[PDB]
Every structure is written in C-alpha cells, then in structure tokens.
Amino acid sequence: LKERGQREVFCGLTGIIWLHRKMQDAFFLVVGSRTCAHLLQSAAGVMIFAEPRFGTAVLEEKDLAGLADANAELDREVDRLLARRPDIRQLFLVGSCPSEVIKLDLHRAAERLSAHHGPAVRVYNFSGSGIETTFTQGEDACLASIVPTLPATEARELLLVGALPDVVEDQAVSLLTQLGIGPVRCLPAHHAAEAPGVGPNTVFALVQPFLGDTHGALTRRGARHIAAPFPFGEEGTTLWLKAIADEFGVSAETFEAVTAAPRARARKAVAAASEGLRGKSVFFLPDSQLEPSLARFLTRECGMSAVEVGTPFLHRGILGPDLDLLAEGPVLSEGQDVERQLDRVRAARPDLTVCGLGLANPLEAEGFTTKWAIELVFTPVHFYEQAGDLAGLFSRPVRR
Amino acid sequence: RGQREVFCGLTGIIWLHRKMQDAFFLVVGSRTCAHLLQSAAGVMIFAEPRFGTAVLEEKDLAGLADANAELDREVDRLLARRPDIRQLFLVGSCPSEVIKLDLHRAAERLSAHHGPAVRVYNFSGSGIETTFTQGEDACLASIVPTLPATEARELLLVGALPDVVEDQAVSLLTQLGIGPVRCLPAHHAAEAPGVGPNTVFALVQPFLGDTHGALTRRGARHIAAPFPFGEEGTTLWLKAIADEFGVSAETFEAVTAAPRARARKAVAAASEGLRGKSVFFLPDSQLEPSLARFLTRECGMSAVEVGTPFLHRGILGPDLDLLAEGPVLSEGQDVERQLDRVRAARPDLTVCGLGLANPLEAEGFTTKWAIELVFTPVHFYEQAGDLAGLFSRPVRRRAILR
Amino acid sequence: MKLTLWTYEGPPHVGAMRVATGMTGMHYVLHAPQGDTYADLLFTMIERRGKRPPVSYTTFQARDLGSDTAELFQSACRDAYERFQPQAIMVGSSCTAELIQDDTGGLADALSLPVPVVHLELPSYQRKENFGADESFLQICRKLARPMERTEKVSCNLLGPTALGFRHRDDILEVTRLLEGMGIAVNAVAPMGASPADIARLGAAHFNVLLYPETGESAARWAEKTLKQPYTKTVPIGVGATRDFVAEVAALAGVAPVADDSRLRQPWWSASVDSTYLTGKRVFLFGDATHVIAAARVARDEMGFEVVGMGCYNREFARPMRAAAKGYGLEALVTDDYLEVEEAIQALAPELILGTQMERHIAKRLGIPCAVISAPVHVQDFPARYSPQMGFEGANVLFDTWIHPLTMGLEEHLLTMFREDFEF
Amino acid sequence: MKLTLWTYEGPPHVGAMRVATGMTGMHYVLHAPQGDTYADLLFTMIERRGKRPPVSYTTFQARDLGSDTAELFQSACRDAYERFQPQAIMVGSSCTAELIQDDTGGLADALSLPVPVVHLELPSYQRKENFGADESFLQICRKLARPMERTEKVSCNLLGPTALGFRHRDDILEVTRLLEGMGIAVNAVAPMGASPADIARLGAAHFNVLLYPETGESAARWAEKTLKQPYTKTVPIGVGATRDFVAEVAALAGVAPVADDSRLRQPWWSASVDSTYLTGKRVFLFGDATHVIAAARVARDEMGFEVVGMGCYNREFARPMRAAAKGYGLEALVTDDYLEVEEAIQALAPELILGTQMERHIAKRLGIPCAVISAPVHVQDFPARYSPQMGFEGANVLFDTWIHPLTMGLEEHLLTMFREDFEFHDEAGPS
Ligand code: PMR
Numbered sequence A: 001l002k003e004r005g006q007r008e009v010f011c012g013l014t015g016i017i018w019l020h021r022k023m024q025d026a027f028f029l030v031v032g033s034r035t036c037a038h039l040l041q042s043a044a045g046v047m048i049f050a051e052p053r054f055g056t057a058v059l060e061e062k063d064l065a066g067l068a069d070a071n072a073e074l075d076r077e078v079d080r081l082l083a084r085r086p087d088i089r090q091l092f093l094v095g096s097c098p099s100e101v102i103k104l105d106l107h108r109a110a111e112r113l114s115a116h117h118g119p120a121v122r123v124y125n126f127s128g129s130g131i132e133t134t135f136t137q138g139e140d141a142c143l144a145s146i147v148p149t150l151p152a153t154e155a156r157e158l159l160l161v162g163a164l165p166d167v168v169e170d171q172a173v174s175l176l177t178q179l180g181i182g183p184v185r186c187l188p189a190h191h192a193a194e195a196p197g198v199g200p201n202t203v204f205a206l207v208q209p210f211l212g213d214t215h216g217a218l219t220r221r222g223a224r225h226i227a228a229p230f231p232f233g234e235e236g237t238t239l240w241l242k243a244i245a246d247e248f249g250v251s252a253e254t255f256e257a258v259t260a261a262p263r264a265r266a267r268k269a270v271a272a273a274s275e276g277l278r279g280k281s282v283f284f285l286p287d288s289q290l291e292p293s294l295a296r297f298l299t300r301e302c303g304m305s306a307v308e309v310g311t312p313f314l315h316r317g318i319l320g321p322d323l324d325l326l327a328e329g330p331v332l333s334e335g336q337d338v339e340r341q342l343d344r345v346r347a348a349r350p351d352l353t354v355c356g357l358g359l360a361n362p363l364e365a366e367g368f369t370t371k372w373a374i375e376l377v378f379t380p381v382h383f384y385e386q387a388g389d390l391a392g393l394f395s396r397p398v399r400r
Numbered sequence B: 001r002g003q004r005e006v007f008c009g010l011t012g013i014i015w016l017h018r019k020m021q022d023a024f025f026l027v028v029g030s031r032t033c034a035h036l037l038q039s040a041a042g043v044m045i046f047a048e049p050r051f052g053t054a055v056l057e058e059k060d061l062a063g064l065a066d067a068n069a070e071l072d073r074e075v076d077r078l079l080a081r082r083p084d085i086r087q088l089f090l091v092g093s094c095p096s097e098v099i100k101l102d103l104h105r106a107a108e109r110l111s112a113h114h115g116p117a118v119r120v121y122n123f124s125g126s127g128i129e130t131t132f133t134q135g136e137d138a139c140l141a142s143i144v145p146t147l148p149a150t151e152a153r154e155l156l157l158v159g160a161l162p163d164v165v166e167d168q169a170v171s172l173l174t175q176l177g178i179g180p181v182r183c184l185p186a187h188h189a190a191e192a193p194g195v196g197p198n199t200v201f202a203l204v205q206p207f208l209g210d211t212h213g214a215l216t217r218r219g220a221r222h223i224a225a226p227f228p229f230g231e232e233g234t235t236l237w238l239k240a241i242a243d244e245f246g247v248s249a250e251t252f253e254a255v256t257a258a259p260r261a262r263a264r265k266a267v268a269a270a271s272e273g274l275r276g277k278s279v280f281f282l283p284d285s286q287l288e289p290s291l292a293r294f295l296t297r298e299c300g301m302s303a304v305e306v307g308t309p310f311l312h313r314g315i316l317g318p319d320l321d322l323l324a325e326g327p328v329l330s331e332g333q334d335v336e337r338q339l340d341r342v343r344a345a346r347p348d349l350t351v352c353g354l355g356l357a358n359p360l361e362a363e364g365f366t367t368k369w370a371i372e373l374v375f376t377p378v379h380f381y382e383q384a385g386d387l388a389g390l391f392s393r394p395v396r397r398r399a400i401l402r
Numbered sequence C: 001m002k003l004t005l006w007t008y009e010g011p012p013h014v015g016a017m018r019v020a021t022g023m024t025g026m027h028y029v030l031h032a033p034q035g036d037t038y039a040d041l042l043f044t045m046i047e048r049r050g051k052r053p054p055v056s057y058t059t060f061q062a063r064d065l066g067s068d069t070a071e072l073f074q075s076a077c078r079d080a081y082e083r084f085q086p087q088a089i090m091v092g093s094s095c096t097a098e099l100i101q102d103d104t105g106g107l108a109d110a111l112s113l114p115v116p117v118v119h120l121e122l123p124s125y126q127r128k129e130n131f132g133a134d135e136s137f138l139q140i141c142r143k144l145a146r147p148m149e150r151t152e153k154v155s156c157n158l159l160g161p162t163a164l165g166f167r168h169r170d171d172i173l174e175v176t177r178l179l180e181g182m183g184i185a186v187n188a189v190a191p192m193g194a195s196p197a198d199i200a201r202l203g204a205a206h207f208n209v210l211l212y213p214e215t216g217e218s219a220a221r222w223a224e225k226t227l228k229q230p231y232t233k234t235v236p237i238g239v240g241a242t243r244d245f246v247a248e249v250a251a252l253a254g255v256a257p258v259a260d261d262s263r264l265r266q267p268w269w270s271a272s273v274d275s276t277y278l279t280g281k282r283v284f285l286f287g288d289a290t291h292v293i294a295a296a297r298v299a300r301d302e303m304g305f306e307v308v309g310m311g312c313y314n315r316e317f318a319r320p321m322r323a324a325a326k327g328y329g330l331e332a333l334v335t336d337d338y339l340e341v342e343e344a345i346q347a348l349a350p351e352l353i354l355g356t357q358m359e360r361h362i363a364k365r366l367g368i369p370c371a372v373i374s375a376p377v378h379v380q381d382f383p384a385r386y387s388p389q390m391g392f393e394g395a396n397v398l399f400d401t402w403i404h405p406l407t408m409g410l411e412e413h414l415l416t417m418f419r420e421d422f423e424f
Numbered sequence D: 001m002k003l004t005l006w007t008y009e010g011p012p013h014v015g016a017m018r019v020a021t022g023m024t025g026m027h028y029v030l031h032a033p034q035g036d037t038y039a040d041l042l043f044t045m046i047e048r049r050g051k052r053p054p055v056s057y058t059t060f061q062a063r064d065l066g067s068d069t070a071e072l073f074q075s076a077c078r079d080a081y082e083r084f085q086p087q088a089i090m091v092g093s094s095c096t097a098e099l100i101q102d103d104t105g106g107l108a109d110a111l112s113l114p115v116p117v118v119h120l121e122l123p124s125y126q127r128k129e130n131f132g133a134d135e136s137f138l139q140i141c142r143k144l145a146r147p148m149e150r151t152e153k154v155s156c157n158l159l160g161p162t163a164l165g166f167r168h169r170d171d172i173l174e175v176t177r178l179l180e181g182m183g184i185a186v187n188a189v190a191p192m193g194a195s196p197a198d199i200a201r202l203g204a205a206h207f208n209v210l211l212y213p214e215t216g217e218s219a220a221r222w223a224e225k226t227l228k229q230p231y232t233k234t235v236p237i238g239v240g241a242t243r244d245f246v247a248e249v250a251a252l253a254g255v256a257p258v259a260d261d262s263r264l265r266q267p268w269w270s271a272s273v274d275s276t277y278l279t280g281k282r283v284f285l286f287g288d289a290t291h292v293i294a295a296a297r298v299a300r301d302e303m304g305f306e307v308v309g310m311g312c313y314n315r316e317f318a319r320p321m322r323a324a325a326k327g328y329g330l331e332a333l334v335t336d337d338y339l340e341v342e343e344a345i346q347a348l349a350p351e352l353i354l355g356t357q358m359e360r361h362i363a364k365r366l367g368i369p370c371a372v373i374s375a376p377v378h379v380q381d382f383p384a385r386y387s388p389q390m391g392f393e394g395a396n397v398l399f400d401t402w403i404h405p406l407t408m409g410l411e412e413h414l415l416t417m418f419r420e421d422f423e424f425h426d427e428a429g430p431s
C-alpha cells in the first residue's frame, strides 16, 4: 500500500545491527551490493569499529555473469572467515536485494556450508532484502531461520521470543519465575548452549511487536501464541504478565504480590514523564512496527491524543491483543508513500510526530516536535521497570 | 646591574618536590610568587602537588607575630591533611624577606609542636637572594646541617638528579668497586646520609654551590671532576671519582666501555644537524659552561658567550679546563645588553630564557629553551646523545620550515 | 565477493545523490528498491540538511519486479515533476534496477518532460560514490551548460564542492573570500549551491577553479574543451598550497598575486618554541587523494612532521598519489580496506595517524593520537563552527586540529608522570 | 591565610602588563625584584606574542636599600625610554616593590620624561589581575584620552579587549564584523590593538561598546562621565544575547538592526533530532563572571541544558552573578579557591563542567565532560584557528566546543557498551 510511492522503511538488514548484539556467537554474512554494504556501515554507525560480525561480502562484477561460480566463491570466503573467526558457531547468511535478483540459492548455499562445516558451525540462511522485508521484519526472518532447527520438545515450556537487552529479558524471566513456574527458553539464544526446546506444547511468548511471520513459523512446530497485549506500559506489560501467568496458571494473589513493587515502581515514573505528554496530538509514521503498541500505551497513559497510528505491516492475530486497548479514534491506515502521511502531518499539525529518521529532521525544521522510532529498538524500554523511561524518551519537550 | 631575566629560586621547588618526596614546601609570600609556582608547574598543580603559597594579605603584613601564629595554624592544618609529610620546608620568598618574617625561628617554633616526625627546615628561594637554580642549591645546603655524620669513606654525590639516572649511576659506580654511595635502596625514605671527615662528595649538578660550602663546613671532601653531562664530562667524572675513592682505572676501562661507545655513537648520530653552528650560551641557569664543553668539543660546536648568573669557579674550574678559552664567559647579566650581543653576533643556536625564546626566535635565531636541561635527563652516558638531540632539534626544525 | 566490513566509499548513486542534494531544485529521481532511501539519512543527519533531499526512490518490492518497475519509474518522474516541481531532473538506477534493466533514459524521454532531464548511466558494481558524483556532474554539465559570452568582469566557477563533503560548505566560503581578495569574482559555485540556471551560466566564466578534483575533474576537463576554460590544478590546502594557488589563479585571470595573509598564524604558531617536540614525529596520512597529498605537503614542510606512511583509497587518483609518495620517499597505499592500512600502521606505529574515521577508531584501538582530514566522517566531524580546510584560515584549522591529539598526549603523559612514582 | 596551590586571578601587576602589552608603544616600567620577570614568559609563551612584552623590570637583586631601589627604578625608566621609544610610559610597583618604600610616580616625573607617564597604584595584597588590568586601563584613559569632536560617521568603541584574554582576538574580529556590517565603524579598539594615539582618539567615538566588562568597565564609566559616551552593557555571547546586543547598539547609534545570521548554524543544529539528548543535562558553570552569565543564558535557552551551579572567581562582579543565579533558581558560588569548586562539583555531580583550566582538570579527575569557558587557561586553549566567542560565529563555536566533550563521552561510552567490552554477562532462561 505505497500507492507506487516512496516507502521510507529500511531493508530488513538493519535489524542485524541488534541481532548480532543478541546472539553473541552468531555471524551474519550479507551478500548485498555496495548499497547494502553502505547501509550496514551507516545504520550500524559505531558498530563497525569494534570487529562486528557484519560480513557484508559485496558481490562484484565477477559474481555477475555467472551463478555456480558465485556460490562456490561464497563457500570459499565463508571458509576463510571461519578461519579468521573460529569462535562462531552459527553463521547467518541473509538474503539481500542483489541476492534476490540474481537468484542466489541462499538455502542451498547454507546447506552445503553446513554440510562441509558440520555441527560445529550451524550456518543458517534467511531473507532480509528490501524487495521482501522492511526494517524489523529482518529480525523476524532471522529468528524464523533457527526455528525449525531448535530441538523439538513436547513438554510444556515457555519461549521468550524476543531480543530484549539482558536488563530487560532477565527481569522478565525473574518476574515470570516469581509468579509462574517459568520454563522460559529465550528463542534468541545468548549462546548456542541455551538451545530452546521449541515444540507443540512449548507455547511461545511473543514480546517484540514487529514479529509477524515468527508467529507462523513457531506455530508450525505447534508453539501457540498467547493473546497478550504487548509488554510496553502500565496496560501492555500488566496484561502481558497476566495472560502469560494464567496461560501457565497463577493465582491472582501471587500475581498481585509479584507485580506490586513493579506497579508502584512504574506508576510514579510514567506520571512524572507524562506531564510533558499531557493532552497533545501524536502522529506515528510507518518506520518500525511498534506503533500500535506505543499508541496503546502512550495515548491512554500519558494522554497523547492519537491522530494517526501508521504501520508499514499491519497484523490481525498478533496485534489484536494490544489492538483491543487501542482506541478507535486513531486512523489505522497502513504504510503509505511519504507524501501522503507527510501532507497529513502538515494539515493536522501534531505535537509529537514519531516517524522515520529521514523525516525526523525535516519535520523538526517544519515545526513538528519529532521522536524517531529508530531509537526505540536500541534503547531498553520494553518492560515494566523501563515504562517510565519510555515515556521520558517520548516526552522530548526541548525548549529552544 | 639592569634588567635580569632569571626567575626566583622557587622554581627549584618544581623539581625538588618530585625528586625529594615526602617534603612539603610552604613558599610564604605574596600572590605573585603564588602565580609563579602556578605557571611554572603548569600541569603539576592538578596532580596534588606538595607545595603551595601561604599568601600574606595586608592583615598578615604589619604584625610579624600575627603572621607567625597564622603560619603555625596553617602548618598544623596541612600536616593534619598531609600526615605523610616527613620534612616540611619553610622556604622564604621576596615578600617574606622584606617583611623580614624569619622562617628560621618559625621552624624552631613549630619543629616538634605538631609531631617530631616532620623535620621542618628553612631555606630561601626568594628572588632577592637566589637566582633560579640557586633554589635547589639553597634547599640542599640547608639540608646539610641537619644531616648526620659518618666514619667511613662515603661518596656524597648530591641527589639532585632523576631517580632512574641516579640508579644507573650508582649501579656503574658501585660496579667500580665503591661502597657507600648515598643511594638509599628504596629512595622513598629520608636518605639521611652521613657526612663526616672522610665523607667525599662529588658535585653532580653545577648549580649546587652553597651545598659545596656546607659539605666543606662538615669536613667533607669535594671532587674537582668535570660534570657528568656528555661524554668527556661523564668519563672524566667517573675516572676522577674512581681515583679519589681509591679505585684503579683498569676495571674502569672495562666497566663503562660499552656506555662510552653508546654516548659517543649517539652524540655522533645527533650532531649531524649540529655542524659548526655558533652557540650564544645566554646566562639563564648558571648551568651553561658544563653544557658548553660538551657542545664545543665532543659535539663539534662553536661557543661564543658562555654566560652565567653566578659563577662558582671552585666547582666550575674542572669543567672549564676542557673548555677552549676562546669563548668568553659572562658575569654581567642584563638583557639590555645580552639581546644586543645576540643580535649582533647572529649565533645560529642560542639558549635564551623562555620569555626571551619566542622573541629571539622571531629574529632569525634558533633558540634552545633552557628550562628543559634542569628538568630533563641530560646526565651521564646513555643521556648524552639525548642532550645533543635536544640541541640539534631547533636547527632541524628551522631547516624544515626554512 | 570480497568480504567488506567498512567500505570507504558508498555506491555511486550515493554520489549522484550528493550532487543533487548539494544544488537547489534538481530532483534526482531513482529506480531503487524499497529501503534504499537510507541514503537520505546521511544528508539529513550528518549534513543536517533541513529539507528532505530532492530525491524520489521508486521503492519497488516483491510485487514489483517486472514492467511494473517501469510503470513505477514513469509515475515517479511525472509525480516528481508536478509535486516536487524542479527546473532540472535526473534519472538512474541502483544496484537492483541496474540488474533489472528498465531503460531509465528511455522512460524519462517517454514522459518528455518540459524541464531538462539528465540521463545518468551509473555502473553500480565496479565504481564508487566519488565516481558517481563526478559522472553525475559531468552529465548535467553536458546537458545544461552551453557555451556563452564571457562575463565582462573576470570570473571563475568553483567546481567540486558537494553536499556531504568534508568541510565543503566552509571551504567554499574561504576560497570565495580569497578569490574576491585577489579580485576574481565567483561566477557560480557548482554543484554545492548552484541552480540549473547557474549551471546554464557556467560557461560565462573565464576559468573554472577545481576545489575538489574528486568530484570536479571530469567537469573541469569537459569544460576545458566545450567552454574553452582552463582550470587550476593546485587545491589550496595549507600555506604552501595556498601560495601556489594564489599565484596560479593570478596567472589565469591576469590580476596581481596579492592575497591578504593577516590571518595566517600557523607559520608563527608552528615555528614557536612550543612546537619543537613536533619536529620529526611520524605520521600516517590516509584518505582522500587530494586531501592526503596536500596534508603531506603541510606535514613535512610547514609543521616538521616526518611522514612515515601514506595511503589513499581513491583508486581513480592513484597516479598523483603514487607520484607524491615517491616525492616524500614513501610508498603509497592505494587500498580500499581497513585491514591493509591497519596492518600498515601497526608495522609503522606512527605517533600521529590521521585520516578517515577508521583511522581515528583503530588509532584509539591502538592507543595512538588520532586526527581527521579525509572524507568518510560522522555527524561530529561535520561541525557547526567555521572550520574551512583551504586558504589561510584553513591552514590554521589544520594546525590546531592536527596538534590537538599531540597536546592531549603530552598533557596526559605528564599527568601520568606526575603524582606517580615508586611506592618504596 | 591559605595554602594557595591554584589561584584563578594573578597579581595586579600582571593585569597591568596585560593592558600594557596589549597596546602598541606603551612601556610598563615596573619596580620588581629580580625574578618577577616570569610574567613576560606567560605572555610570550601562552599567547605567543612575537615581540617581547614591552615591559621593563627594575630588578633589584639585593640592593634593597631605598636609596638604591629608587635609583634602579629611575635608571630603568629612562633606559626604557630611549631604548624602546614608546609614545607613553606606564610605571607602577609590584609585590615587594609595594613593600619597599618607593614613589612609583614621583621619580618618573622627576626624570622629566617628555612622553606622558601614567602613574599607577596597584595594591598588591587586596586586589587581583582583573582589577589591575581595569585600573591600568582607567589610568591610560585619564592620561591620554581627551574629549574631542564626534566623528561624522557614528563610531563605536570596542572597549575592553586586552592581551592574554580568553579569545580576545577572534572575538573582536567577530564583533567588528557585526558592527560594521550594520554600518557603525569602530574608532579605536582600545587595548589588544590601540596605540596611545588611539587612546588619544577615544574621545571621538559616539557610543562605547563594553566588550569584556571586567577589564574595561571602569574605563567605560569614566568615558560615559567625561567623554559623554554612552556604553552598551550586554555582552553578545550566544544568539539571544547577540540579538539583544545588536538591537542595543542600533538604538545607541540610531541605525537599523540588520543581522547577518546567514552564518548562524547553532540554533538550527541545537534544534535537531541528532542532539535532543541534551535536554536535562546538569551543567556546572564556573569562570569569570561575564563569561559565566553569558554561558548561563546560552546553556539554559539555546541548548536546553539545566544549569545546576553558577560560580565565579572574581568577587568584583559578584552582584550581577548572584542576580543571575537567583534568576536561574540557583545560588551563586563566588569564590577564589579551587577547593570549594571541587566540593560543589562533587556534591552536585554534574554532567558538563564548563569552567576555567582548573575546572577542566577537576572534570578529568572526576571523569565528567569538560570545557573551557573562561579566562584562566594554558597555551592550548589559545588556538590559532578563528575561535571567537561573541557574535553569531561565536555562537557556532560555543555550540561545537560545548558539545564536543559530550560526544566524546557518548562514543566512548558506546564503545564500552558494545560487545567488545560487554562479553561478561549472560543468562540462560531461568539462569
Ligand atoms: C542508515 C543510515 C543511518 C545512519 C546515518 C546511522 C547512524 C547514526 N544514526 Mg541511526 N543511522 C542510520 C539508521 C539507523 N540508525 C541506527 C542506529 C542508531 C542509534 C542507536 C542512534 C541513531 C542515530 C544516528 C546518527 C546521528 C547521531 C549519531 O551519530 O549517533 C547517526 C550518524 C542517533 C539518533 O537517531 O539521534 C540521536 C542515535 O542515537 N541511530 C539504526 C537502528 C538499528 C538504524 C537502522
């Protein structure tokens, strides 16, 4: 739904920036052209300067006018890199726009590399091109790549399917064990040691909103989805914890006792950040798909009137839980071309104008106080203890 | 007579406090000497230094006894904040001399009142008596009377020299069959060397004139040896010491043969840019002739005017004996004439004072700024080619920039 | 195929985008995949250019991989004309549409837009952004700049400055000051502030001036024949280069070589007794070819630095680079990866390495004093403060920026020396 | 009284030297003991003045007897006369020269100097270097300047600049550019570029402009009274202050307030999504009072910094500073010792200590980002590049110089946060 227009979202490879942070024993070999190489170089920023696992093998002209030579050469370069990087145990080949158009057999390449490399390096392939994906969707694809490989466990386990920082995922696990049993197995494994036992009865806890196809891939293994509004505020977090609890079985008393300290911990912080957001117009442009959750939280807690919650990729079975808390007032429009929502912003002037980084500076110069959603994925604001920090981040009431 | 550019003796404190640790220096004076310490230290003052200025406001001007009481209070406060002090120093300054605020009697007053662990001694870096490096001289010379005596042949080369070079020197010198060297093994405690009739002190840095007198007062024996700056200076120094202490030269020729080779090789490597360049040794630190002999002979230089603020010929005669008597010396110091002589003679390398350095360099003169050689290691063999290097630096920089 | 981690240069369409964003009113419409708009971030953040760069990516997806891409481009052009009304418009493709050939120029002609359209042929797999920029500039000069009457006053065009360029914005101001000081009036700076009207007026000058040969040599060479316009070779970075440049444009125009140097403090501030530890320090210059060559002419001739290394990443400019490397007695490192230069400085261990952002970062990783002189930079290196790199004030800027690492090093060395000795 | 290891101000005679060497053709014949020459080194090396500071020192090595010292002072006066050929002579006493009984001006008159001789009193034990500079300025204005006819074109006087100032050179270039771009010419920048002839012409400009109040305000008041030249008050450091200064000088001269803000980058850059992390950063603000007040306005308005503490080291300007601090919700911290500054920073724990040389080091010891916004600085902070502080280009400078330490910290803290320095913690489900 771009009306044949400029969809500002990034190609899925930008998700690799934080994925490599999550799975610290995983390398990501991207076969993109110099454009995709420049994208990784830029969007990663300071990542490049500390030996990042961001192989951006550029396919040059010799890789053109030839197919078997290309993936044979790819095999060669991979072997070279594990020679330089023996520590890596899972290599993440990723499909790029150049890789898609030249019809590179990324799956077959990953297969032969795994075969000659063995279980010591379980090289995996997925797709993160802009021809198919859009920013965060890359993380979806990357975790979906490991989903079939993960050990099959028919026992009732919980899956922490999300790349939240340690100071977030550890807190989530601690709370869940505090009220529930917590057979929590984080799907984005910190190391290959913590291989999660995905299975039929291993119901998976979805915690990052942008994860769409993830749902499908995990449900193929039988892993069911909890209809829990996304843990991103006094409503999303509380509802998510509640639903996760009753899914495994937790008394209301135990839930209240466990979440009593976090509840008061975050209520004061969110209020102390909300007065900068008290009664103003918002506008979510389709950058990264957290906007529905952000509207579910901020509109109802900090009193930010919801004008339009744009979304590049709308979902019905995943977004529904937090969709229920969403008011009908905001326009649920999907991700249009930049001109459309830009003109909407100009017409219905919003106080806060959350959008992509590319429009952030112009609309900032165009009299729109802007907060870029790009900051959201890196800054650890996806649980109870950081709900106030999220509100402070959204606040941004800079005066001159 | 005239405008003299040499700084106060407090400039001695700057390296004295580092070289003689556990020693705090109360420079009692005005805001002016306070500023001088500030600027001279430059970045030391940030690193919690062991000095400071006890400013005399108008309040502490008329009443000398009032100033004394306030100074005692200040001293107690400092030692409470600095218990590690082992020897406080009541160093006088020009205002202190004018106010005739006798810090000697003050040191008597607060000797053991706040603990006998702090041996408060008094010297005077005041610009009204001393001139620059005369500070460290005066400090160590006031140290001398409090020192104990000894009843053995003891080598009292005066410890005004960097600990690394000092360790090198004591290593080689003990290797040359010599025992007591005033080398306290830890060097972090009060050395308290013995000074008796058989004590033999070897002057290490030329500026230590009144120290020589003090040791002579204590019956100690001087060594008339050329000062250990370059190659011949260090060689003659060691040879002389070896003779007077009783050591032969046979083992000496083998002990420092390699060091002699390094010194000569490094000087030959660094004097490449220094080929017959005229040197005007402006009187700044009274250290000049010792450097001159090195330059003019073993570096291959041409001295013009090896001046000095003060001249202690008793300890300079050895060094001068190697100097070619062509180059003139200077007991008369006045920039009103020194700069004129420099401008007329057009020396290619001049050791001007820092405040005269940049102006002189603006007049087509490569200026070796002289505050280094007191502060940087330029002594003995390993650090002779280094010294030649700092001297060859200005001409090379001129060469690059034309 | 080669595993790349930090490409010194972006793809060439980034260079064309730089030229388009630099000048006013020329919409560089693109046949690019959905997501390739990442380049807009560079101009909107690192250059902090307010308005969105005047570029309209088609942003095609899995839905669009056939003739629908051609229809996308058709729309993109007609839209861009009406919505983003230009006076001149570019066409071209990224890597994806380079492979999926769509005849960009044919599509643009099919619209037959009244404003001139500049067909851009940009090989996006064997060339880089510096090329891309130069090629784009050349194509718009041959499409818009036609020979015309000389301005009655002697006048010159600055060619080379380009949006997202290392201190280009300040350097135009400095060189303009200097040229006016001599008496030469600047006819039209292109392509950093020019407009299609200005590119039309380009021919009216007496002689082009090459500020940045990387993005301007092709334009100047074409102007030499089409417009009968000589172009000066000596980019004026540093005091010596400034003197040569002054004399050169003086000869070219006909005016006296008088240039006001009352703001020159570097000759004095480096000849001072303070700057004597700087003599004979080892330096490793890396980065843009012209910047590196002029920075070497400064380091070895006005500062006293001893050049122990030298290297470049503009293969296009390897020949002058190698010539200068012989000039200083070294061997040029005409590479394009950080591994080679990293190994080079590790072997060399110069006191002050300086160059691209990578040089600074692997200086820090190696704990070596680090400065920045070349093109690839981040938002910090793009300053708000007036910091040109050419002219006399450029010489002073070079001085301070280069010895700041040195002063930091000396002060920290002292601080560690002091307050620290043997415990006992 | 106290153990002063750090003293922000210097002795009064140093300020007198600042003024003297700022001028062209003015010798500061100073009674001083041998060694008090050290300040010539400060001027020569920190500021890198080619020609040696035109000051003489009647160094009395050990003839401290009043008969001798008087003779040395007289001889030095006359020698400085026919040696350096100044158009006027400045004579005073420093430190012990105050203690020693001399008539610092009577002898200078007695030598029958044909060139004017300005007698200086500098109480060397209750005043400081900023006073000394200002008082020396007042003296040279009294002696040399004289009311004459107003220039036909409105001429503004750049009162205040001296040598060894914080960017007292790029700053006057910037202010002259703004003023002449509006149209007003400058008659004579009085110190940091004014022969005694220029001071003689100070009575022809229309309206004074007090660039740096501290060193030149007293001259400004004397100008307003005797020369009947109104003096502006606001210092144009920043953008808001610059607009105010432009309007003020427009009113004082009756001209249009046109401003060349085309160079203004700081407003737009501060108002950028790149640098919104600035909001809510406590900044400690120390240094000389003028620069601190101006930095207060900039930090609170242009950058959105929440200022936590404003102190100064010159008591002479305390009252304006306490006024401003009560404005910003704080209390001024006018002091003289570095200890109280260290304590204030320690307690308040800022994130950006904009202060003098010592505050820079206090920051580095404490690991807090540092910057220099005042007068006491070593040679490093006197750059060769065009680095003004007032004017629009001054606003740009301010922006970058203040932001650069925070960015150094951020990219430093990032490289720490990054996996290269963070492969130490791990979690495996429920541990
Ligand atoms: C692809 C272009 C681009 C550039 C220029 C970078 C680096 C950088 N991106 Mg943003 N960044 C781009 C995109 C993205 N950035 C990424 C990273 C990153 C962060 C965490 C931050 C940010 C920002 C920036 C900036 C300007 C501020 C900075 O250098 O950190 C650069 C050059 C900056 C911000 O948005 O404003 C404060 C900020 O704190 N980006 C990510 C998220 C994975 C992507 C997809």
Ligand code: PMR
Binding pocket: B011, B014, B039, B040, B041, B042, B043, B354, B371, B372, B375, C273, C274, C275, C277, C410, D041, D042, D043, D045, D046, D378, D379
């Ligand atoms: C202008 C007064 C001044 C300042 C600010 C300092 C610090 C300092 N003085 Mg030198 N310096 C001045 C005076 C003195 N310095 C002192 C200390 C010291 C030395 C030994 C050295 C030095 C130098 C300097 C420096 C570095 C900048 C310079 O002045 O050239 C400062 C900040 C420094 C240098 O320039 O060489 C690399 C050098 O090695 N200072 C002393 C010894 C008592 C003197 C006389």
Ligand SMILES: [Cu+2]
Binding pocket: C408, D408
């Ligand atoms: Cu720095």
